[PDB]
Amino acid sequence: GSALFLVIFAYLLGSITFGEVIAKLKGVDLRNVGSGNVGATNVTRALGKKYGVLVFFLDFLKGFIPALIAVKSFGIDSWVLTFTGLASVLGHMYPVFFGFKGGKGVATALGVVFAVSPSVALFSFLVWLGIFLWKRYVSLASITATISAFLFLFVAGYPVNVLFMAIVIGALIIYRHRENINRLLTGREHRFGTLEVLFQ
């Protein structure tokens, strides 16, 4: 079963949290530093910007490659794509190889949305960039850009399987951001500023 095989492969590949991998092989436990997350932001806090951008690239590929196989092999309207993108995001969030504690799924979801539509991923990235340049909170930018990815796919008239994939990935990412959210509502969320400019 090529479809079921590809969903399983998206989940197993997504389970490779490269922030955990690169941090542990660099000698660091990400759960202790920063937000406790295993993604590019916390990897940047823990190991510098070089390793964060690499882990972002890898977690992005985790979602891009299986979703691209799904779109090319079954079509943009196939539910194999829905379950492939969901499998990558869930594999990144609940990794089978790392005790089912992983990240919040933003980079991988960006891979999925890029395989679906590079232009939607472009404008969603522009949303993220605007929010981060404006308010200097990574999480706020990620939440807004996720919701906006759904909004763009909706306004473009993308099929129902893709809109459902986006609704579920988005709800997943927000839920995984709940603690960032209450940190934002409490004034205790990390704000990037000239301290990182000087010492990152």
Ligand X SMILES: O=P(O)(O)OC[C@H](O)CO
Ligand Y SMILES: CCCCCCCC/C=C\CCCCCCCC(=O)OC[C@H](O)CO
Consecutive H or E run containing 46: helix 40-47
Sole binder of ligand X in the list 17, 84, 124, 142 (CB under 6 A): 142
Calpha distance 133→137 (Å, rounded):
8
Identify what 175 binds: ligand Y, ligand X, none; CB under 5 to 8 Å per kind: ligand Y
Calpha distance 39→173 (Å, rounded):
13
Nearer to ligand X, 66 or 102 (CB): 102
Which region among 20-28, 66-74, 90-98, 136-144 touches ligand X (by CB under 6 A)? 136-144
Residue 39 is a binding residue for ligand X (CB under 6 A): yes
The 8-class DSSP code of residue 31 comes to T
Residue 92 is a binding residue for ligand X (CB under 6 A): no
For the window 10-39, what string marks contact with ligand Y as x by the rule CB under 6 A? ------------------------------
Calpha distance 115→192 (Å, rounded):
30
CA dihedral 167, 118, 5, 174 (to 10 degrees): -30
Contacting residues toward ligand X, per CB under 6 A: 34-35, 37, 39-42, 104, 106, 138-139, 142, 180, 190
